[PDB]
Amino acid sequence: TQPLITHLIELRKRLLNCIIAVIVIFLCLVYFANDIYHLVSAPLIKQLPQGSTMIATDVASPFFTPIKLTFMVSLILSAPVILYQVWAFIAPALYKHERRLVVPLLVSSSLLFYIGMAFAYFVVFPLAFGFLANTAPEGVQVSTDIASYLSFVMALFMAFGVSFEVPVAIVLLCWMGITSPEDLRKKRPYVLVGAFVVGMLLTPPDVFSQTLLAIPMYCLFEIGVFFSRFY
Amino acid sequence: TQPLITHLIELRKRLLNCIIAVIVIFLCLVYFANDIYHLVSAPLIKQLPQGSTMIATDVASPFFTPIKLTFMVSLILSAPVILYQVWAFIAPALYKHERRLVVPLLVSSSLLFYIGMAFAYFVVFPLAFGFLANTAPEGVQVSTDIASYLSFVMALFMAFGVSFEVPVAIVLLCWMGITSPEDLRKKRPYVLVGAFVVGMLLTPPDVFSQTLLAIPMYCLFEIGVFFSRFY
Amino acid sequence: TQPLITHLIELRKRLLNCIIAVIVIFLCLVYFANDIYHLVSAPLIKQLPQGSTMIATDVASPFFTPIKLTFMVSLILSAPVILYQVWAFIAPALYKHERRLVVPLLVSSSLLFYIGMAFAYFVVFPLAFGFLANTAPEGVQVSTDIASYLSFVMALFMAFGVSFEVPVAIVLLCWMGITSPEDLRKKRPYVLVGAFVVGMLLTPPDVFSQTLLAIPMYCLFEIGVFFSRFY
Amino acid sequence: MFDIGFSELLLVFIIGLVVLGPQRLPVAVKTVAGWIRALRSLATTVQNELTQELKLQEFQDSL
Amino acid sequence: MFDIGFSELLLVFIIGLVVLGPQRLPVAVKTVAGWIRALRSLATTVQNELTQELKLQEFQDSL
Amino acid sequence: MFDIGFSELLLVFIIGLVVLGPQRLPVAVKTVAGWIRALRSLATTVQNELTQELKLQEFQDSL
């Protein structure tokens, strides 16, 4: 017995609940795999050029890719459950009265992720696909692979969900006791290198992708510092 | 002289024989590069939907992919030659009269790989392609890349050839002296983790693929233990 | 102060100049992103089979791939600027009168890179694409992806630019004082393994690609030794 | 791994050198290396105490 | 590198913890680490023994 | 990463063994390992010397 054994006993139970939640939601939505794909592909299908459709270059892509969507959809849907068990596992270590503040904070951090995906799906996806599709060089047929589209969609959903949380996170820390606008301003050079490091570990091994995802993070950090001054 | 130099002298000769066997078989089949690819693609072409053909998204794919298949066709064809040299290199270390038992065993392990490939080609390939091709979401054109098809096809041949050997390997070890059904039942939890590790080192960096290849190995281990009790 | 701090102060300035040179050229050519792509894709378009065009399987490929090409084109265009700053940073360490010889040598190494690119574009590209495009198996439609075409084109430009410099480099070292044909002939086995290792670090993780790029390096090293004897 | 590349790693060195300079970048490398040391210190401690709780507790019940 | 991924490595820890529990998984890690120690011991022995066969035999003929 | 793979690494050992043989390949491995030692020696010297130039000079001006 004793600690460092019961901790994994608790973590095993919490991990099982996250696995159970993911599986249960996935099984419920496994039947409507193409229906979610139709919703996801609707912003692109509307903006696709005339004569251009979606294609499947992989043998198992017609079946696995919609199933891959449903598994990721279950992960996002079960995120409050996953975050609850992580909080509960670290709850005994947060008896210092900081537990009261983090209970709604994690709840508030969940809507911001969903609002970011809704903003990307409703505002950005029609605008991005309306430009990316109808900008190909002459003689180039835009036949978007459904496997590559899912990765692009999930990258943007992750990017925009994280993007919405950053300014509010900066403001909340800079509001009460943790940081001040002066401290975050003097850490500006280190965030720029940190943005490249974070982007490098999140983007595929391509210098263009890391250079392109890191700048928004610095931009999101910049507005958050700007907003914290208006407190 | 002395050992650890003659050993690599012997291994150098065995490696040369395996290299020569691969090259000789490859050169014989290098002229019929498209003929084998037509045989390989025939299960998919028959089940391809109307208006759907195979495509080549890579510049050198129309010529490299048939060439790639022939090289890896020669590897399977030269596997008995390759396995003979590996056995011969370890033959002096197996003078304990275990050499007699392993000579048929390695030979018997060769047809099982080929029977698994034949089973996949003649039974599974028409069934899988007849379902995977005609299951795409609405508005999706199944234009399978010949480069991605080769990787998918050879993974299934590797999967089924290894799949056929596992139950017979388990039964043989559980038959004479090595293991018993009771021992393999108490190692069930470790095989489950081992299957995930083996799949992780064999599947591309995708959590979906590792989770999908690991389960068959556990299933193959399960039936092998079941068959060993019927000894 | 003192060395190892002023050295990075100098390297910081030289790195800035390379960055500014790349950005300035990229911004000038960023507007004509498709025009350079049309020039790059012209050899393939001319030799494409009837009914076969270029496709874009990636969502952001129609916009990013022309943007990516201009970025790498700026890198090659700014290579004389990049090489100048690298030489200048190591110039104080080359006060042994070897600085005089390397000023034209680095300059002469710049045209050879461009001549190799011109040779690949004008001589090899029409010949290679005329064969690769019109060699697909029956029932296979050559739908070349624009993203994969850029990687193929960039690798060939890099390969031929490096290919042209190697024989002249061998002759130059074998000419004055550094090496002799006898020394490079006795290092033939080590270059063959070195070619495979270099092939590892430049080709994607595919055994066919490393085996296919390494042989030209050994061939280029072979002719350079042959030409050094005619000195 | 987290999609590690060559040009990706060189950029951070190039970007880090320009942004930080030869007065803050070496401190960042030392500070980052300190985090790795802390992780190794935590890993070294956790692994030893984890074994020290499994083997002795099982062996103590045997006695 | 056999196509190692981040989520792929986390799953083995997640699957391993659930299947094995906090009583068999740490023993498995120690057992797995013991295999690496044997490989390092074999690598250390082979490298020195192979060198002890090339250099000394060649040098002995010189004498 | 410079796109490292499994079959690519096995080929170098296979090609290296055939081309070099068991009389030149182990010397090549030792020679290659010496280059890594030199890089570590340069890295060890540079890291300590750079620290001894940044920290000491800043502290000296304080005195």
PDB file of C-alpha atoms in Angstrom, chain C residues 17 21 26 30 44 58 66 99 114 132 137 139 148 193 207 212 229:
ATOM      1  CA  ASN C  17      21.420  39.532 -43.402  1.00  0.00           C
ATOM      2  CA  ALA C  21      17.853  38.704 -48.193  1.00  0.00           C
ATOM      3  CA  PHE C  26      10.427  36.284 -51.390  1.00  0.00           C
ATOM      4  CA  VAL C  30       5.337  36.473 -53.803  1.00  0.00           C
ATOM      5  CA  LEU C  44       5.279  18.133 -66.853  1.00  0.00           C
ATOM      6  CA  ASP C  58      -4.520  18.981 -50.101  1.00  0.00           C
ATOM      7  CA  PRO C  66       2.983  28.199 -55.136  1.00  0.00           C
ATOM      8  CA  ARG C  99      41.110  33.532 -48.302  1.00  0.00           C
ATOM      9  CA  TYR C 114      22.576  27.032 -61.364  1.00  0.00           C
ATOM     10  CA  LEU C 132       7.422   8.841 -66.392  1.00  0.00           C
ATOM     11  CA  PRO C 137      -0.050   0.691 -66.071  1.00  0.00           C
ATOM     12  CA  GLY C 139      -6.290   1.556 -66.275  1.00  0.00           C
ATOM     13  CA  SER C 148       4.088  16.001 -54.579  1.00  0.00           C
ATOM     14  CA  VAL C 193      28.948   3.331 -47.518  1.00  0.00           C
ATOM     15  CA  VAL C 207      14.808   1.793 -48.626  1.00  0.00           C
ATOM     16  CA  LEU C 212      18.432   4.999 -55.739  1.00  0.00           C
ATOM     17  CA  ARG C 229      44.012  11.629 -63.899  1.00  0.00           C
TER      18      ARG C 229
END
